[PDB]
Design an enzyme around this catalytic site. Structure first.
Site, short mmCIF file in Angstrom:
data_model
loop_
_atom_site.label_atom_id
_atom_site.label_comp_id
_atom_site.label_asym_id
_atom_site.label_seq_id
_atom_site.Cartn_x
_atom_site.Cartn_y
_atom_site.Cartn_z
N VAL A 1 49.90 75.09 55.92
CA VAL A 1 49.03 73.96 55.67
C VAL A 1 47.63 74.45 55.30
O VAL A 1 46.98 73.85 54.46
CB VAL A 1 48.99 73.03 56.89
CG1 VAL A 1 47.77 72.12 56.90
CG2 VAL A 1 50.29 72.26 57.04
N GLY A 2 47.17 75.51 55.96
CA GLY A 2 45.84 76.04 55.71
C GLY A 2 45.53 77.23 56.62
O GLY A 2 46.21 77.43 57.63
N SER A 3 44.51 78.01 56.26
CA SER A 3 44.17 79.19 57.05
C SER A 3 42.67 79.31 57.23
O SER A 3 41.99 79.89 56.39
CB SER A 3 44.73 80.45 56.42
OG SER A 3 46.15 80.42 56.36
N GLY A 4 42.16 78.76 58.34
CA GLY A 4 40.75 78.90 58.64
C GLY A 4 40.50 80.29 59.23
O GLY A 4 41.30 81.19 59.02
N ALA A 5 39.39 80.45 59.95
CA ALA A 5 39.08 81.72 60.59
C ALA A 5 39.62 81.71 62.02
O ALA A 5 39.91 82.77 62.58
CB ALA A 5 37.59 82.00 60.53
N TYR A 6 39.73 80.51 62.60
CA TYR A 6 40.28 80.29 63.94
C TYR A 6 41.70 80.89 64.04
O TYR A 6 42.06 81.60 64.99
CB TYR A 6 40.22 78.77 64.17
CG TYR A 6 40.85 77.91 63.07
CD1 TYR A 6 42.21 77.64 63.06
CD2 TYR A 6 40.08 77.34 62.05
CE1 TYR A 6 42.80 76.89 62.05
CE2 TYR A 6 40.65 76.57 61.05
CZ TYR A 6 42.02 76.34 61.05
OH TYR A 6 42.66 75.61 60.08
N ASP B 1 38.98 70.42 67.38
CA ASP B 1 38.10 71.55 67.71
C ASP B 1 36.90 71.24 68.61
O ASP B 1 35.88 71.90 68.48
CB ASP B 1 37.53 72.17 66.43
CG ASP B 1 38.49 72.90 65.50
OD1 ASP B 1 39.67 73.03 65.85
OD2 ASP B 1 38.06 73.32 64.41
CL1 LIG Z 1 41.28 71.86 59.97
C1 LIG Z 1 42.53 71.96 61.25
C2 LIG Z 1 43.67 71.20 61.18
C3 LIG Z 1 44.63 71.30 62.16
C4 LIG Z 1 45.79 70.34 62.00
C5 LIG Z 1 46.32 70.02 60.75
C6 LIG Z 1 47.33 69.03 60.69
N1 LIG Z 1 47.72 68.38 61.81
C7 LIG Z 1 47.18 68.62 63.02
C8 LIG Z 1 46.17 69.58 63.14
C9 LIG Z 1 44.39 72.16 63.26
C10 LIG Z 1 45.34 72.33 64.37
C11 LIG Z 1 46.67 72.67 64.10
C12 LIG Z 1 47.56 72.85 65.15
C13 LIG Z 1 47.09 72.71 66.43
C14 LIG Z 1 47.96 72.85 67.47
C15 LIG Z 1 47.53 72.69 68.76
C16 LIG Z 1 46.17 72.39 69.02
C17 LIG Z 1 45.28 72.21 67.97
C18 LIG Z 1 45.74 72.40 66.68
C19 LIG Z 1 44.86 72.26 65.66
N2 LIG Z 1 43.24 72.85 63.35
N3 LIG Z 1 42.34 72.75 62.30
#
Ligand code: A1CRZ
Ligand code: GG5
Ligand code: ZN
Length: 333
Positions: free
Chosen positions: A26-31, A160
């Site tokens: 879905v995406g790859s941030g720095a987290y 977050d």
């Molecule tokens: Cl920008 C972003 C999006 C997601 C996400 C995308 C789609 N659906 C749900 C979340 C998570 C994300 C994605 C998975 C997660 C699983 C457990 C706890 C927090 C989580 C956060 N983080 N950052």
């Protein structure tokens, strides 16, 4: 223990239980990295996040622990929560990766212009989640559109929490005030609400200086009551040295918008944080008359953040995190 399968997605190794199928990036941030998947056990679409180098340093290890503790504590419909947490590791000694799972959300608020009715529902949901977060003495500090997940149904969840961004930041923060309160989040909400109503970023500063100047242009330079609360000698000179500007008339600046929405904006975008409206007070504002239900805007159980002041070894943080994985109990379907 469950059976795990391994695969490589975007130069990232993913090792998860068989129950989660059809992983798709879905995406790859720095987290960390996220994949959408199908949970055969519940029939639900989920998002799986793999933390990036969770124990590469004290900072990372403490951050991994902080996020897991916070996610295990948040149980609210408008706050991202945990469906599951796991590691392929079978012992602490082998423990080096953490996977978090939540409901899959299709989009964020940046991906929308909106009717006044949709603005009401979306901001209502943000405040309802903030009320809960704030009740646990947690501050988000980085609320912005990209941190607000939204599905087709318009249901919203805050991501977050307590973990340009500058466009939604409270002025007291880029004044580097170190005693800012929870109403820093209310300022962000006000910036978000304004943007949903106009279709434009309210304060698109290019840097911290410009950002403050855009802010004071709308809300006016500080009054003498606010000036008395600034300890920094530097800050005062800078501020008192600026070309004093008056607070603008919000009814004119946002002319055309629902007057109730304007009234609320004025209460949220107040320079002095001690005068800003709180999340709980905002929920009772006449703007949300159609959604406000005082018996269905819950608060959180006390949240123990004492660990924040601890200075431990990487292995200690790692061990503490391991414990949090193991003690995890999923929420009732
Ligand atoms: Cl920008 C972003 C999006 C997601 C996400 C995308 C789609 N659906 C749900 C979340 C998570 C994300 C994605 C998975 C997660 C699983 C457990 C706890 C927090 C989580 C956060 N983080 N950052
Ligand atoms: F120009 C500004 C902008 C914001 C503030 C402010 N609002 N709430 C708290 C403060 C603040 C900022 C710096 N030092 C003390 C208090 C003070 C002056
Ligand atoms: Zn629905």
């Amino acid at each position: 223990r469950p059976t795990f399968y391994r695969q490589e997605l975007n130069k990232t190794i993913w090792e998860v239980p068989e129950r989660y199928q059809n992983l798709s990036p879905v995406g790859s941030g720095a987290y960390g990295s996220v994949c959408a998947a199908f949970d055969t056990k519940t029939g639900l679409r989920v998002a799986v996040k793999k933390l990036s180098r969770p124990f590469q340093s004290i900072i990372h290890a403490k951050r991994t622990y902080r996020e897991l503790r916070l996610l295990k504590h948040m149980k609210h419909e408008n706050v991202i929560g945990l469906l599951d947490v796991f590691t392929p590791a079978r012992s602490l000694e082998e423990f080096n990766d953490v996977y978090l799972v939540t409901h899959l959300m299709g989009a964020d608020l940046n991906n929308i212009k909106l009717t006044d009715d949709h603005v009401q529902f979306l901001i209502y949901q943000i405040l309802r989640g903030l009320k809960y977060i704030h009740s646990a003495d947690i501050i988000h500090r980085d609320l912005k559109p990209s941190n607000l997940a939204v599905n087709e149904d318009c249901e919203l969840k805050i991501l977050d929490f307590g973990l340009a961004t500058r466009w939604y930041r409270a002025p007291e923060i880029m004044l580097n005030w170190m005693h800012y309160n929870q109403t820093v989040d209310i300022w962000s909400v006000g910036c978000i609400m304004a943007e949903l109503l106009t279709g434009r970023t309210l304060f698109p500063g290019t840097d911290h200086i410009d950002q403050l100047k855009l802010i004071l242009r709308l809300v006016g330079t500080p009054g003498a009551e606010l000036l008395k609360k600034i300890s920094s000698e530097s800050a005062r000179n800078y501020i008192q040295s600026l070309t004093q500007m008056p607070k603008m008339n919000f009814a004119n600046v946002f002319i055309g918008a629902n007057p109730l929405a304007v009234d609320l904006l004025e209460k949220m975008l107040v320079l002095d944080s001690d005068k800003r409206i709180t999340a709980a007070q905002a929920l009772a504002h006449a703007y949300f008359a159609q959604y406000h239900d005082p018996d269905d805007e819950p608060v959180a159980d006390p949240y123990d953040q004492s660990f924040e002041s601890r200075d431990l070894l990487i292995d200690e943080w790692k061990s503490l995190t391991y414990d949090e994985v193991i003690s995890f109990v999923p929420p009732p379907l």
